[PDB]
Design a protein around this nucleic acid. Sequence first.
RNA 1: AAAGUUACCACAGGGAUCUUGUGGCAGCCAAGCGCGACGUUGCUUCGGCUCUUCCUAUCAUACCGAAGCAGAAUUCGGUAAGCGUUGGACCCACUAAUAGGGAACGUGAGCUGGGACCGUCGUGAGACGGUUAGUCUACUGAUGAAGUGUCGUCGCAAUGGUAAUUCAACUUAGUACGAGAGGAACCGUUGAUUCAGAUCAUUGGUAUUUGCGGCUGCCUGACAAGGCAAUGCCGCGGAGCUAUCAUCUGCCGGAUAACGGCUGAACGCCUCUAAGCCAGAAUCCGUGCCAGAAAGCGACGAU
RNA 2: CCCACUGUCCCUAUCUACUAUCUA
RNA 3: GGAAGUCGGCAAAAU
RNA 4: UCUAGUGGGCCAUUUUUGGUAAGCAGAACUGGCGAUGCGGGAUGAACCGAACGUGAGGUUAAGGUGCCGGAAUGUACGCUCAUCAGAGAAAAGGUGUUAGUUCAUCUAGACAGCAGGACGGUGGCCAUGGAAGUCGGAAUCCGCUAAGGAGUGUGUAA
Lengths: 23, 335, 94, 35
Amino acid sequence: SLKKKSKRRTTRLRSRIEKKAAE
Amino acid sequence: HGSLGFLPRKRASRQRGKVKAFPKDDASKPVHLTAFLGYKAGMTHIVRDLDRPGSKMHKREILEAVTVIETPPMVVVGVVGYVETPRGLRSLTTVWAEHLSEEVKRRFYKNWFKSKKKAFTKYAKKYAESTQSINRELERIKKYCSVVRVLAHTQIRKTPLAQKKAHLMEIQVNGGSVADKVEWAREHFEKTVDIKSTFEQNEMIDVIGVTRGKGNEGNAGYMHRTQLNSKIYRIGAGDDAKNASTDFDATEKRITPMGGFVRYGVVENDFVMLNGATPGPVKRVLTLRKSLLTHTSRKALEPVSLKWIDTASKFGHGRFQTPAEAKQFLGTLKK
Amino acid sequence: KRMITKATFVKYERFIRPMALRQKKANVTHKELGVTMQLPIIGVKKNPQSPTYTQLGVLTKGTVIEVNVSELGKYAQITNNPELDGCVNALLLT
Amino acid sequence: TSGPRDNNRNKWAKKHLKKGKRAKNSNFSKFLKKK
RNA sequence: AAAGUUACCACAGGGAUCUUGUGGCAGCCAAGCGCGACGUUGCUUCGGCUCUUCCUAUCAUACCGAAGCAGAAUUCGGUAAGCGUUGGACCCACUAAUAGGGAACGUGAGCUGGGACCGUCGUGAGACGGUUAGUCUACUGAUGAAGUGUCGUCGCAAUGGUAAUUCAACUUAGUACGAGAGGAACCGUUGAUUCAGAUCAUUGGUAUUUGCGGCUGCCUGACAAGGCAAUGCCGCGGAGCUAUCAUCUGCCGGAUAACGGCUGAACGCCUCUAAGCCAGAAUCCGUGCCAGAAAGCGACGAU
RNA sequence: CCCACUGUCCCUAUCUACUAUCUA
RNA sequence: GGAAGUCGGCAAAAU
RNA sequence: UCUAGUGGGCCAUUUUUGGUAAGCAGAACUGGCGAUGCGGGAUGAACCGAACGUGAGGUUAAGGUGCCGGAAUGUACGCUCAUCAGAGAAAAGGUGUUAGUUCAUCUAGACAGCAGGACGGUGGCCAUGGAAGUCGGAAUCCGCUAAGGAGUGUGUAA
């Protein structure tokens, strides 16, 4: 992070990001 | 709860209050001491004129409770040299006096009576035989070390205390060059340094010591504490009979209250009277140090002239300063 | 519970129609004139969402409602959502 | 009110060190030193 | 003769089961890509006490910016969570202020307050039952064996914690300023609130000092003498404990934010910024204060 | 509601026994 | 000081 | 001929049906899992490789080669400085940087900067204590030039 927030994301969060990118 | 700066609330790991900071050294100032060791005897109440400009009791008198600490002259038995290193101060070497009194020799032993009294025997032998080693060590301190602390011990025999072990400690020698401090320590070897020479009853000093234990509470008590800005009101001399006699009172008397100090005894040596309360109960050793940072406001700068010092019987409801005037007022007893 | 959750206009009354949700005046904007006039809601012609809503007189998007046009009765279609906008904003059928 | 870390208060403390302090304390140490 | 219809439908059964500060609608434009932004026209069960911390989306305290901001008292806007944010019944008064929130069932193993099935009788209607069914760790302190030959003294300080807060009074003043009405501020100074750490000179409280005295009753045939009574009762009572019911003390350096500037290019001008550099907040980091690594260490004494 | 009263409270403090604790 | 405590004179002392 | 076991689902692609504040909902489609360990993705039911007797040697896939970690702190060319770098909130904003694309001036002297002009009818016309270009409302003409407006703003009671 170092900023305020973790760059690394939750695995279910990544997948739904992929889903949101698809639709 | 209280302040979080004092936790973890645990017992102090020392009976004698250790100095954790000394006033900053100055080459402009000549060579002197900064700390002293005394024993708490109790306090009385005194009447003092109030020369406080801008106050509502200006040119008046108030009653102040003032703690009395017996401070017999301290004996310098050695010197310690400190060299600054990238990991902090480090004790480079230590030089002791040739002859050490039994009061300070008792410190090194848990059982002085059963001991063979062998402390510093070969040290005294080598001191008398060859002084080249002592000269080499003192030259080492004045050449390499940047901080000099003199080993001094208290004359506990003069105090009315059953304890015979002297509270040896170090006093940082602030002032002058390092050579000046070394010369000062060598001249003062085996001699005595007096509180009259250290403090002079009108400056603003700090008192440090361990508080009294209150037992177990839902640990509470017996902790190292540092009181700041405790003003000296009078450095009385033990030999002088006018120590407790002011200029407005006369009435030749001694600082020890009639009936004696409760659980301490009678003060016979030089005493110090400090305004307000100080940590620790009676007969506990207290340490005094100079002001680390210079701050003399009107309270810390105004001169003080005592008017009357109470010496009534602190044991019970005492009502007579001295047995002399007590017998003058009271009718003649059967004895 | 059983109550009408949408703004409407005021056995058969099985549900409950809130008085606060009910509206009586509609802001109808004329097409040719391009002016918004606040006319009373004479009645609800037909609600395409549900005939029961039409029977209950629920004011919804696309619902036909008749309002007085004497000062300008004519029908009009509600082009807004009264449940969200908070006002019965409709456009005249002319 | 301003706290003890007030930058101006530290400045005024520095100014008053050489006005009502310092010299009268240095010689005060000197007197008991020559004692 | 009956038949269709029911989203006016009602009674049983079967299936299904991120968020915050900008209104909408209709037109006129409309950079542009039939839409079309900014603009423009209309009209209108929950609920609250304590507690711990934490967030700042800051009520007060500190410092700045702006405003017809003379002064004073304000208003708005920045940095800012260090420090606070009461006492009683929509109030109330105090107060510098009585800010908003989180701990998704804030803290109910801190705390409290404001039935289902079946049956039976039943039209448009509701009741009178039989079964029933709940499930070591952390922190606070306290010792402590041990490398360092052994024991001891005097110290070093890696690291961890931190603390002070707010107000009104004097002077500067009835000056600056103001037609007048009014009326500042800085330096310096004295007190008081809140909090923190101590202390028991004095004062109050405390009584198993069963310390002294007095009273009641009891027991020795009497006098006296004593002894008593689960601490019989009363007065005083050291010592100790204790009390914002008593008393003391509560620190200094830089670096910054907002912001004000200096030199100065970019961009032959200019510019507080780009490289650089000052001034500057109750902020930050140190100092001071507390702890001392129980597997960090030094000097020294003896053997 | 008025009056009186009191550690209910501001704000707790002290004493006593028992408990609690350790030992066999 | 005297119910300001707490939803409240609950318990004590007063009588 | 006869005789066991199976009659679920999950995930994903594509087409399509409507869509809806936004999600999604309905089919079909063949896949992957399901019966299945292994390499990699830091860790993993669904991602990239690969499918299995016990071993030796060689070589690869996917992914990697600063150190933890086996393997170049390789080679070549560029971009980027973040006082919260990097490994849907979207319309935009930025005197942040780099390339281009288009259009403009330019020895008749490019910008920029210095030295000036920046005029005459005319104070055009109204307005009102007054506004002479710059309280304001309509006009917006003009002669001279190298060029000067019925004036770009400051300013002025004007």
